[PDB]
Write a structure and sequence with these properties.
- The PDB classes it as transcription regulator.
- The entry lists the keywords structural genomics, gntr, transcriptional regulator, bordetella bronchiseptica, PSI-2, Protein Structure Initiative, Midwest Center for Structural Genomics, mcsg, DNA-binding, Transcription regulation, transcription regulator.
- Four copies of one chain form a homotetramer.
- The first copy, chain A, is of the alpha+beta class.
- Chain A has one domain: Chorismate lyase-like (Chorismate lyase, 3-Layer(aba) Sandwich), CATH 3.40.1410.10.
- In chain A, 15% of the residues lie in helices and 46% in strands.
- Chain A has a six-stranded antiparallel sheet with strand order 2-3-4-7-6-5. A two-stranded antiparallel sheet of chain A has the order 1-8.
- Chain A is globular.
- Chains in contact: A-B, A-C, A-D, B-C, B-D, C-D.
- Chains C and D meet through strand 5, strand 6 and strand 8 of C and strand 5, strand 6 and strand 8 of D.
- Strand 5 of chain C pairs antiparallel with strand 8 of chain D, so a sheet runs across the interface.
- The complex binds chloride ion (5 copies).
- The site of one chloride ion has 2 residues of chain B, from loops.
Chain lengths: 162, 157, 156, 159
């Protein structure tokens, strides 16, 4: 299936035109300390980071920043990402054998930063939905940190609660 | 326990105050969400939640009159009870599920002062429909959250 | 990704299609799918195996109007997980599911299909899946053998 | 409100009484120590209790709590309490659960459990093994529940 965790849904009637992904950045770096703690890494551990844009109905809707433990994702390259017709979580499953069983999220409303605003086609200060996620594999092992910034003007985040 | 659906968590306990309580003919949208007849009477409440002495949420709720008859400002403001608990104990309506739609919005001129912010300030808007037994809708609740000290926590399977 | 709703997890999955048939909706099925009475539905029975042993028996009911062309030939011609097929071939994506879980005794009918004795405790998962607009699109009844696997759930 | 995590819902149309069976302090079993992220040999409080609905036994729950945080938890406190257990943990002990992770399976009623649910040994029960978490992902409870799902089911919504 198309999505693992994405809760974007259109405001208007119909099936959510499916998200198109475009990789913006891809680098390896030393984990910032907050990242290393979220991923239960040793200080100084290398992480792969990706920035991507999701677009829906030909309009940018999400800017995602992801951080992955360098250890498990050594094979991850820009060439792989950009050639890949897969959604990221599907890629992590098929190429890297990493399947997420749970995600813990923290949602807030924030102002569009000077850096983010033009990537979403908006003015700085525009309210955006920030979704900070840590995703877990089996045994409560953290394997991804993702911070999403969502422009919720034509789309909402759908949540059912028990 | 203290909370039924509230997902506010500190980045590093809620106190409620009733702003408004009123009975009226259900607006179209409400009648639809609550699956009421046209113009059926509903009770509407506006309320403010604060945490750590600071305003955090404004909620507008709409409830079907026929299940919430005794529901008065007097019952409310004399109530030292959370609203879902009041609905359970006093009215015998327990919620089994809620469906929510979350968005980020600019603080409206109406809401902004109620949260101590400038109009335009980013707020989390949580539109909820709560269901009781039989997939029966019992409440429409629109919440505007100031997320400067608090976030909305969610776990996904 | 591989799964939409499946919560089976190893204490530490291959699908075989048994049937795919059109019939008039049984009453409980038309009610759940909100169909006119006796509306045509497609029903599927399938078996999931994990580690080369049968683990789940699923029965599924889908509205015929949205699943025209959903045949045994298609299901066998195709590689796809059923939810992925419903999205890619039929354009039906599930946004929500409501489930009811019970422990039940393996019925004389189901016990042989899981390789167990009638009476054996099974996890019964009764699901209704919804698409956009809170339209029910699927009724799925699963019976799960939970001797090596459990159903994982996180609660808020 | 009445329930924190309980997902029991009746099969029959429409809209739960607790009785303490056992209570004591013990050295954590190794698996319990691991679930609660305790040091080896830490003391836990353990409670068994019965839930009934419609004046019939429906649930047997076994609970393990960190002895450190739950020093004042006594039998006399429990049986005098008019509160739901999660309500007591909140109000008396300041422990509030933000999340529960569960593992559900169908099991045979054991000779020990069966009499307490009014069933015969071998009857199918739903086992719900739970770890509950407070803020910061700190585990504060292990609960194993055994549910008779003959007139009740476990309701779950999935996104
Ligand atoms: Cl590009
Ligand atoms: Cl008040
Ligand atoms: Cl979920
Ligand atoms: Cl939940
Ligand atoms: Cl007694």
């Amino acid at each position: 299936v198309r999505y693992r965790f994405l809760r974007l849904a259109p405001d208007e009637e119909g099936e959510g035109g499916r998200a198109e992904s475009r990789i913006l950045e891809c680098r390896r770096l030393r984990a910032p300390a907050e990242i290393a703690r979220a991923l239960e890494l040793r200080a100084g551990e290398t992480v792969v980071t990706i920035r991507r844009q999701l677009s829906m109905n030909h309009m940018p809707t999400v800017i995602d920043d992801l951080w992955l433990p360098g250890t498990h994702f050594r094979g991850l390259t820009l060439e792989l990402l950009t050639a890949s017709k897969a959604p990221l979580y599907g890629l992590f499953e098929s190429e890297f054998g990493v399947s997420m069983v749970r995600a813990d999220e923290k949602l807030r409303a924030v102002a569009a930063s000077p850096e983010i605003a033009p990537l979403l086609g908006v003015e700085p200060g525009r309210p955006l939905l920030q979704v900070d996620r840590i995703s877990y594999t089996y045994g409560d092992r953290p394997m991804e940190v993702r911070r999403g910034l969502y422009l919720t003007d034509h789309y909402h985040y759908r949540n059912s609660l028990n």
